[PDB]
Amino acid sequence: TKPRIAIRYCTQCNWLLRAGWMAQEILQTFASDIGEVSLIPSTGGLFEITVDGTIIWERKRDGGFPGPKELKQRIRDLIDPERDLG
Template identity: 70%
Template sequence: MTERPRISIAYCTQCNWMLRAGWMAQELLSTFSTDLGQVTLIPGTGGIFAIHLDDVLIWERKRDGGFPDIRVLKQMVRDHIDPDRDLGHVDRVNLEQ
């Protein structure tokens, strides 16, 4: 059996970003449930908000200009672990916008 992908979310405790990190972890676990090996929250300081998939940095707040939209984050994770997977409404464009 191959090892399932691991996600880590490092967040700044000084900036009170724990709830945001926890919500993103919950969303990823809800969407990818048994496809992920773990989702880890890592408290830090200094304005950090970084998301790693295994050892690949897929989002960094300073580098990428803020926080990821959950739709974008789910698509990024999907593209790494199962590119052919349909994410349902997350993949559909809202034509009314």
């Protein structure tokens, strides 16, 4: 059972591009280790990324949007903490 990642993003805030980019950054790094990445259109300024239900990022709490390094690290810390990302 490989982990499942969800990205909930506000459609009218035009956050689809950044959500899709982040999905592709995740899949490029963790291709063989994750089951899927789900892009979930949402409303009202929501931007949230979960790994099997655990929030690794949420816009209000985390103060914006993640850079690729910090996103990969937070996913790694949950699914494969021993992996060196460089």
